[PDB]
A paper describes a structure:
We report the biochemical, structural, and functional characterization of the protein coded by gene [name] in the [name] PAO1 genome. Our structural work shows that the product of gene [name] is a protein that adopts the [name] subunit fold, which oligomerizes into a 12-mer quaternary structure. Unlike [name], however, the ferroxidase di-iron centers and iron coordinating ligands are buried within each subunit, in a manner identical to that observed in the ferroxidase center of [name] bacterioferritin. The ferroxidase centers in Pa DpsL catalyze the oxidation of Fe2+ utilizing O2 or H2O2 as oxidant, and the resultant Fe3+ is compartmentalized in the interior cavity.
Prismatic crystals were also obtained from the Salt RxHT screen condition G2 (1 M MgSO4, 100 mM Bis-Tris pH 7.0). Structure solution and refinement produced the model termed Pa DpsL-dd-Mg (3.0 Å resolution), which contains 44 sulfate ions, 24 Fe ions, and 37 Mg ions. The locations of the Mg2+ ions were identified by analyzing the Fo-Fc difference electron density following refinement and by computing a Fo-Fo electron density difference map to compare the differences between the DpsL-dd-Mg and DpsL-dd data sets. Except for the presence of Mg2+, the structural features observed in the Pa DpsL-dd-Mg are nearly identical to those observed in the Pa DpsL-dd structure. A network of Mg2+ and SO4 2- ions are observed in the structures of 12-mer Pa DpsL (Pa DpsL-dd and Pa DpsL-dd-Mg). Four distinct SO4 2- and three unique Mg2+ binding sites have been observed. Both types of ions can be visualized in the Pa DpsL-dd-Mg structure The SO4 2- binding sites can be observed in sites 1–4. Two Mg2+ ions (Mg site 1) are in proximity to sulfate site 2, where each of the cations is coordinated by the side chain of Glu 106, which stems from each of the one-turn α3 helices. Mg site 2 is near the protein surface where it is coordinated by the side chains of Asp 167 and Asp 171 in the C-terminal helix (α5), whereas Mg site 3 is in the 12-mer interior, where it is coordinated by the side chains of Asp164, Asp168 in the C-terminal helix and Glu 72 and Glu75 in helix α2. This extensive network of Mg2+ and SO4 2- ions coordinated to 12-mer DpsL suggest that the nature of the stabilizing effect that Mg2+ and SO4 2- have on the DpsL dodecamer structure originate from the mediation of otherwise repulsive electrostatic interactions that would take place among positively charged residues in the three-fold pores, or among the high density of negative charge concentrated near the C-terminus. Hence, in the absence of Mg2+ and SO4 2-, one can envision significant folding-unfolding transitions affecting secondary, tertiary, and quaternary structure, which largely destabilize not only the 12-mer structure but also lead to proteolysis of the N-terminal domain.
Author numbering:
A (entry chain G), F (entry chain H), G (entry chain I), I (entry chain J), J (entry chain L): 9 to 177
B (entry chain A), H (entry chain C): 10 to 177
C (entry chain B), D (entry chain F), E (entry chain E), K (entry chain D), L (entry chain K): 8 to 177
The structure:
Amino acid sequence: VQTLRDRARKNIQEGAVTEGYSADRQTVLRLLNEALATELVCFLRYKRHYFMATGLKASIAAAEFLEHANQEMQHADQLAERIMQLGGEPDFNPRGLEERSHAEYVEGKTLKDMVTENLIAERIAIDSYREIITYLGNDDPTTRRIFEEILAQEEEHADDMADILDDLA
Amino acid sequence: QTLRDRARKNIQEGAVTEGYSADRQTVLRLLNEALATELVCFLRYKRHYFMATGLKASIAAAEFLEHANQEMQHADQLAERIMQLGGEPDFNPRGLEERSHAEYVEGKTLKDMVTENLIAERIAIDSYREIITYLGNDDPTTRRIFEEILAQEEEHADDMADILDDLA
Amino acid sequence: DVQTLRDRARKNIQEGAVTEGYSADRQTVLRLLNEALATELVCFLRYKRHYFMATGLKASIAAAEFLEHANQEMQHADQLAERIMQLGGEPDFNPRGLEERSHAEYVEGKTLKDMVTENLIAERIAIDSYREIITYLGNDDPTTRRIFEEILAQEEEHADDMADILDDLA
Amino acid sequence: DVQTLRDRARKNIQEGAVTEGYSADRQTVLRLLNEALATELVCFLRYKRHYFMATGLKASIAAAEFLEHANQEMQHADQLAERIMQLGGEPDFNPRGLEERSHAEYVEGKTLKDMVTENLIAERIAIDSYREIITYLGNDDPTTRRIFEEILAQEEEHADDMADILDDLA
Amino acid sequence: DVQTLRDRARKNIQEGAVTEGYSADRQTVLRLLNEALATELVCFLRYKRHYFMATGLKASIAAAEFLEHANQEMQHADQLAERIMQLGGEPDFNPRGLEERSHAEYVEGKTLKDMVTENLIAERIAIDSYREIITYLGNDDPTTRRIFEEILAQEEEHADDMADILDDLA
Amino acid sequence: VQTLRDRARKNIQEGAVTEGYSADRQTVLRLLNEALATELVCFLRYKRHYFMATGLKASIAAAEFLEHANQEMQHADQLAERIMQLGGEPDFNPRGLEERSHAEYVEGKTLKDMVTENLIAERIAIDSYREIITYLGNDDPTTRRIFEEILAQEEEHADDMADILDDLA
Amino acid sequence: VQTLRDRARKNIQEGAVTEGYSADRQTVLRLLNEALATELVCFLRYKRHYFMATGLKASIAAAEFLEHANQEMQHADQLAERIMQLGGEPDFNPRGLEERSHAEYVEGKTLKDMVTENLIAERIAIDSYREIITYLGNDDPTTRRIFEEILAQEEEHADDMADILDDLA
Amino acid sequence: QTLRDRARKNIQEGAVTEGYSADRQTVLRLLNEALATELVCFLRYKRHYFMATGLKASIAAAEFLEHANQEMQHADQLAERIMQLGGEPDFNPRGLEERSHAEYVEGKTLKDMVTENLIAERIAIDSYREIITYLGNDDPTTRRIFEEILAQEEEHADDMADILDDLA
Amino acid sequence: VQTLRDRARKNIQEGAVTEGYSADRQTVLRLLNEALATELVCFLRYKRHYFMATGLKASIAAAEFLEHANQEMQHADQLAERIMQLGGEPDFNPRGLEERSHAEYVEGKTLKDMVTENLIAERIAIDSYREIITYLGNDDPTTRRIFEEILAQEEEHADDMADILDDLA
Amino acid sequence: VQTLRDRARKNIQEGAVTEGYSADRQTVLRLLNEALATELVCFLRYKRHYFMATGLKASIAAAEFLEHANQEMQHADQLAERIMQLGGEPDFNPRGLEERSHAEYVEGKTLKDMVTENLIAERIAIDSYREIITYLGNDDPTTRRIFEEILAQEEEHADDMADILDDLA
Amino acid sequence: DVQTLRDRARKNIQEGAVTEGYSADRQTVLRLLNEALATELVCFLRYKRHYFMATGLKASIAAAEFLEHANQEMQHADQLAERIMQLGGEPDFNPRGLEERSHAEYVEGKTLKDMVTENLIAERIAIDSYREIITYLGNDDPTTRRIFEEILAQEEEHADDMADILDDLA
Amino acid sequence: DVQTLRDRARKNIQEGAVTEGYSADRQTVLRLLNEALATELVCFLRYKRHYFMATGLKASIAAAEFLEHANQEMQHADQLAERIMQLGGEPDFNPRGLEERSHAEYVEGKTLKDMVTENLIAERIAIDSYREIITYLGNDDPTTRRIFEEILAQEEEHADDMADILDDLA
Ligand SMILES: [Fe+2]
Ligand SMILES: [Fe+2]
Ligand SMILES: [Fe+2]
Ligand SMILES: [Fe+2]
Ligand SMILES: [Fe+2]
Ligand SMILES: [Fe+2]
Ligand SMILES: [Fe+2]
Ligand SMILES: [Fe+2]
Ligand SMILES: [Fe+2]
Ligand SMILES: [Fe+2]
Ligand SMILES: [Fe+2]
Ligand SMILES: [Fe+2]
Ligand SMILES: [Fe+2]
Ligand SMILES: [Fe+2]
Ligand SMILES: [Fe+2]
Ligand SMILES: [Fe+2]
Ligand SMILES: [Fe+2]
């Protein structure tokens, strides 16, 4: 009626966040920024491994590392965009990046080191994003779908790294 | 051969099988209302697109056109689903606004246009959230349409608010 | 805090995508994925048959739909097989017993109305079969659920497509 | 002789494309453009309705034409709306009273022959309307005339397309 | 007003693009289109002949032009044939009597200067021929007029191209 | 050695036609020109049918007709180019085109007429080109391959047209 | 049809200009070269404004400036090509370029200066080309269509510049 | 007009004219056996593609997929020829292997997979050489299909042998 | 003869670094890693500003911000690759990134803040890379050319940001 | 350090021109505008020759003429953009264009005239830009690289024109 | 018989494409392939030399043909080298003795007519060499035969191209 | 000022890109360009040999680099040859004495490590050779110097690529 229009007019500057938004906006924003930090850390680690993984066999892994690195940055972009829509600020500050994150930057010494560290990070991300998807439930479909999409990519990343690690003894 | 006999019965219903657990007639009503809403928002954005002239306004005018054509994609997604679920998609311009959750509003200033669009996006968001809830797990294919459309409307609302915040 | 998340991930690391938080029945999900895989392969072969045999002016319009659907069935086959690998299984492409593993049948058909009906029946079998899998999965495995949800939507489109044709044949 | 051309351009400069030499009846040309815009919007909506409803083997062939035509009608709408702006008017996309502003009607039709005939009628109404407008414009407004000359040619093609279909139905 | 436009469109609906307002001599416009169609087909064959026979360094430059023109002539042929159908005629592609229906001749030529000159003659025959048709049409048939206006401009470009070559051939 | 070069020097203007060209060059040239005329006739017939085959079912045929028309012209170009290589002249004269040809231009009144006339022409070309391929044998691989390629297309055209004709009545 | 052929043979070197060309070839060439000069001047003005229109709002104008500049050069090419067809010489001499044209090169100091000067040139061009289109009448369809097509672009340019100027003050 | 009467007789037979000197029935049998071989080889390679994981094995897995899709191109090429010659292409998975000249073999190691593919390629090479001989000059269009497929199978055999030489 | 080959064969594993490499490789490597840290910091700042610069005018700046961000990452890749070729390790560690860098991550509160911080960072890099180009001289053309190319891009970035800043006040 | 930052803040609006800019900005700007005049003049000459060079043989030269014309315009844009970065104004005024230039607009009567006049202009530019490259030295790498790149293009143009002229007589 | 086909394939499996059914003289076919490979490389170097040296308006036309042909020669070289590997040989790219292994010569030429003739001579040498190789192969090796047949047809085109140029040179 | 620049350009006009201001030793630069051209052609031939012979899973990875490098070498060859023409020389593509003109050798290699090492040696020979030429050129010839600076940078990348491979080979 004229109430639908009045409901939309109230707090109009809140944009995507309407009166019917039933999630905890503050908490979803916290989770998005933690994921953002995790993605940025994983981007830097993978790029490091990409340049360092030289040699015939190792170059195959280096290709995966770079492919993954840029996919992590796409995840960062998806998350940063949602942070803006939900009224937050995406934190790209390198200071304290690792502490905000669920991941660590680990140089590694050998190819086995690099492959394992990426595999651990992918598995940390998988379980962490599964839990967020549960927390969101039906309160925020748009954010849930972002994590659902990122999750499937992280599961592919973990499968990719495990397939390599199995040949590395 | 029991699976085959279920599919063999009422074969002409096509996508709608013995396992379709939603209230098909109601889903069809909701789909047509959404279709009317998308067509109205398409016409509004096209109006604003042509009228938003000037340096700043041309920036909004680009968004207006981008959004207009996205609204029509949603209309197509909804009309296609109406056909699959055994209904008829209503493109009749008569009573279009009354079928709709949105209004066609010309606006006089850019702030008028931007606000009217923002109001429409926020109305659609809450409507599609409710439909998504009503569907539940009874119709994944239709639910996913509204979830995909919903996400776009949330982006449109963010886009329009980002503009409105600087206009005054 | 950081070392508990990390210690959960280090345990059974070779399991890859399957983490400690994976709450589905990995063994059963794998069985369902391979049944769907067999179904997609069977439907791919039927549609390719119908594509080549559906000659004539009107039938060539159906023949196009048949080929489009065939290649979509193979995309579904690849999608399911990739998930089978991620969950630690082996995707079964063996043509022996392919039909018995499947939810659908290869049926040559004699007339175009036969071909359209057999395809329409298969689509409707897949729709209800995959709806049940989506229900079985619940919230335990979003990634697999999303595969079936996407395939389901395509089968509903295929069923509508075949039904739209069948209504004009008699 | 240089500062008179320049002074002619300075007078009423905000009028833009409409120069001192514009010899047409701007107010009337604007009315004709908005009537055409309403007609294109109605024809767009009719064709989209027919596109979705024309299912079956033969009908899918018409449905392709229906969609092709629908989107061409929207291009005509855009061309007309852009010219309305250049000539200092406002393009009216309001769905209220759309049909009364228009030379065409939204007609659902029940059968394919209904849909094809209704489209054919609309195309032929547009052809004679735009012929008259082109005559009314004459040499007073080449730019607007060329828009209608371009749209007319497309509408003649639409009419040929629909008649070709109708000849096999009836 | 609403129902007289519609009654006018409904009458003789099968005539398609040709509405009650079509003021040209449909029978004669069709005769002119088929003559032009024959000319384009003849000119296509001449240019292709010259394309294959014009070998050598210098000649290959002309041969490229011959081929470009050959295919532009065929585009004009299709363009005319499509309008013939819209106006209710039949486009005559019969090679029998093709040359006699035409305004041009197939002339093999022995030298490059022969080939260039014969093409230049045909271009100049078409230019004046299509100028006369454009005048005959006047405002009675904008859509057909624009076809000849567009073809004419291409033919004037063809004549310029051939003349530029002939000037070096002495 | 120095004879290989001396064989190439002799009659150098004959170009592709070397001392080893063992076929009956004048006869091959006649066959190429007869085929060239056949393709031009088939091009004109199909283009006629393309424009005249209007209506719902018939428009499906019209698409095949146009597709075929342009393939016939590719064959024409292929043959005319080979005529040049073998020292002849490609004859595009519309006068007597039909008499030089193995096929006829036939307008047809019904769609069944058009489809049948095309089907008859395709089957004529098939047998003509089969015989030419046999006649050439190994004496002229380059020309043989042109006919082998054209033949394969004509067999497809015949299959296409017969498939249509079977449901027309 | 032996008179048509002899008509074409007479004065064959004149090319596109046939015995039936009813316009004043000499004057049309004069009008085309004036138009060519206008297009070249407007090209130079717009390129100047493009480089000088820096800033947030102004960069929006700068895009239109560059878009228009290259559209002006396309018009210059159309006119030059037609000059050749009608037997003239296209004059690209920068010396006296401004005196030959209907428009001026004006640097402008502010953005409002630049926009106003472009709008003035567009409206001068619009009325000049309207007159040429009338002068040509039915004597030269091909040249008329060139000016008709250019005219329509100038009306778009005038609308584009007016829409900007209305917001500047 | 005698050529025309020759073409009119048995017109519905399409591509198969009076001059068709091959044994149409036998050529059709061979095409369908080849079609079965291509389908089996498609399924084997697809299995190997998904199962060949690891650093080295992924290199083989790429070849496996490339070949898999080339096999399906051959399948289509053969099926279309079956239609032109008036037969029916048999895609039924029942008895597919018995109709085929090749086997589906899962393999346990990468060397097993590579070896099984190499065996299948060498079986096809010799099968298609014999068919090319049988056809002779009786059916150029069919012969050329086998000649094209043959060259691809020879490429496949070289690719697989090149892998196998380094595995042990 | 064999002196060219024996010279190349000595210390072969050093790869791109031949006997003729006359630069101070360890120092060049230090400069390369400092620049890499600068590029990553500038990447993160620009991405922050890109997401935060909302509104009609600011969205124009946001586009420049994103364009620049990705060019900064291209520079990072270019430097990291040269680090590898010259026998070092590229440091992507986010800990202490800002201290290894010549630039700072600064969120900024206003658009003028963001633009000014970016302009300051661009001008720091310009002078820094000019000095490196001088330090390199003719001893290492390949590395010199990398900084020359980056410098030219940074000079464009400084002009871009300065052009925005004049309209901001 | 914070002096590095303060150095960037001093005269911040000067953008690409930093405190370390050691060239004579005023003179580099004068040289850039002269070259801009040269490129515009050479653009106009080549366009004239392009339209006027008709005939079989001449059409080959006409193609080179147009290719070069558009390459000259690219140089023009490249120089004009650098003029902006260094704080000047690019002068596109057609008035006095030729006097500001190092080249002349020359219509030429024969094809040999056109080729010769173009060849002369190319060789004037080659020596002119070599001197500018020397004057710049190490003071302005970014500008030096622009002239170095343009120079290479002009040397290619000279070789192209000489190759034509050698066969013309 | 399913295990004899398999046993034939298993015997000498490392020979790859070379099966028990390979009826040609593998050693001799490899010799001929390497001779052709040398011929193609020499012809590549000749054409590249001619491409750079053929300056002037008329000559620039020839230079384009020279470059196109040069790169087509390199495709032939690759095509032959790939077949050499498949048949179990080693492709010899050694510049030492390249000319002695080849059927053609590297000839700089002084005039354009020199360059064209030398290329024309080389094309005609290859034509007769490859016709003989095609005959020698007969039905023993279809895959290799088809390589020479495809290369041959290109060489026949190259010869026509050079002769067409030479005829106008004097 | 105007007519002196013009007179300087007019003197020795046929020398083209080489103006009075060319301060390098043109004869010597031409010698160095031709030596480099020989090196690039030899390196092209070596890498092509290695590309075809490096079979196997790991080696196929090297084979890709080998082919990528081979074709980059040919780009360098063309870049150098074009500059030879501009400076008034003739690029020598003669395979006779090619190796003696070159700074590198064609080496077949027996193992993959052999192939990788020979390429690595060649890259390092080229790297120091082109650094010296860049120094010899100084500021006398920017256009040629930039060619060598660009080629050098590619060779440093090639050397790094080959070294990266060699470390894992043993
Ligand atoms: Fe991620
Ligand atoms: Fe990941
Ligand atoms: Fe929407
Ligand atoms: Fe929306
Ligand atoms: Fe499926
Ligand atoms: Fe319309
Ligand atoms: Fe219409
Ligand atoms: Fe024409
Ligand atoms: Fe044909
Ligand atoms: Fe055919
Ligand atoms: Fe303009
Ligand atoms: Fe196969
Ligand atoms: Fe195979
Ligand atoms: Fe920067
Ligand atoms: Fe230049
Ligand atoms: Fe050749
Ligand atoms: Fe190189």
